[PDB]
Write a protein that binds this ligand. Structure first.
Ligand SMILES: *Cc1[nH]c(Cc2[nH]cc(CCC(=O)O)c2CC(=O)O)c(CCC(=O)O)c1CC(=O)O
Length: 296
């Protein structure tokens, strides 16, 4: 076959991601015909893998060859025969402070309403500023920006990568350093899932793998796997390559910001997976187990 079918969600950001993968595949393999198969997910309407399940069914029944996701949305477990095989070059991994009326988090007055449905984002903000009111916010990037503009929130937190890819860089009032808001696992990277026995597809995808990003995300995911994490839990997991070593930082927090368990590991790139697992067991042994129990 000379055709590759791409399964993707149907929001403006998911289609931007699908086009980025399609452009990269055409640049490496000029005779390939790339087709798009956009589809809704449970996540779009309201096991887990709320943003991926219908995509994976597409692959199992040979309706698509690859599924393109934002890495933070990929679950730590997969149906047999599927896996994540390519991790694309990481874009800015930071959280962003978005507000029409305020210039920074410090400028919000007590009682101001900040929208986010991420317990990872909430625990960290509540830890520093218990005077702010953190209210759930759901929806695609443009739906969230509308609710801000309609005055339902004073500010909201989104990933910088999403806003930059949509050409909405002007809505970023401030990129929050990882030390103020530790990113979710894989934040900023696009991941490609496919059928593991499909060697033709896996060969076509190799040119898209970004080694340095794959090392970072491997360590972040090994941590989350051990904690049995996902988007609904208050876990931050973030790796940087600093002078030839991986520096992994992780946190597990109580949603009210009362208790936050933090840890860090530094090591050789070859040990990315074992470093993540070790970090996760240090957190669990330190009280992360009970915080997650009270979540789940
Ligand atoms: C892991 C994680 N995912 C999300 C939210 C998310 N993922 C995909 C979408 C649709 C984006 C679009 O296509 O424009 C969304 C947003 C949604 O459907 O509500 C989160 C939540 C972020 C938050 O509410 O702040 C998380 C958890 C995390 O980042 O820690």
């Amino acid at each position: 076959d000379n055709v590759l079918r791409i399964a993707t969600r149907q929001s403006p950001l998911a289609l931007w991601q699908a086009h980025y993968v399609k452009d990269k595949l055409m640049a490496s393999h000029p005779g390939l015909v790339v087709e798009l198969v956009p589809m809704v997910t449970r996540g779009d309407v309201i096991g887990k893998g709320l943003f991926v399940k219908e995509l994976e069914v597409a692959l199992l029944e040979n309706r698509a060859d690859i599924a393109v996701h934002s890495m933070k949305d990929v679950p730590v477990e997969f149906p047999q025969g599927l896996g994540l095989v390519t991790i694309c070059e990481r874009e800015d991994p930071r959280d962003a402070f978005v507000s029409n009326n305020y210039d920074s988090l410090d400028a919000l007055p007590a009682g101001s309403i900040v929208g986010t449905s991420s317990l990872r984002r909430q625990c960290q903000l509540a830890e520093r500023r218990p005077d702010l009111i953190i209210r759930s916010l759901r929806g695609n990037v443009g739906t969230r920006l509308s609710k801000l503009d309609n005055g339902e929130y004073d500010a909201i937190i989104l990933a910088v990568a999403g806003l930059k890819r949509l050409g909405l860089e002007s809505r970023i009032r401030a990129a929050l350093p990882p030390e103020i808001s530790l990113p979710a696992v894989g934040q900023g990277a696009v991941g490609i899932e496919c059928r593991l026995d499909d060697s033709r597809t896996r060969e076509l995808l190799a040119a898209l793998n970004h080694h340095e990003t794959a090392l970072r995300v491997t360590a972040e995911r090994a941590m989350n796997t051990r904690l049995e994490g996902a988007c609904q839990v208050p876990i931050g997991s973030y790796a940087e390559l600093i002078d030839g070593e991986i520096w992994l930082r992780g946190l597990v927090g109580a949603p009210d910001g009362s208790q936050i368990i933090r840890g860090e590991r530094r090591g050789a790139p070859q040990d990315a997976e074992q470093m993540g697992i070790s970090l996760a067991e240090e957190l669990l042994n330190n009280g992360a187990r009970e915080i997650l129990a009270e979540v789940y």
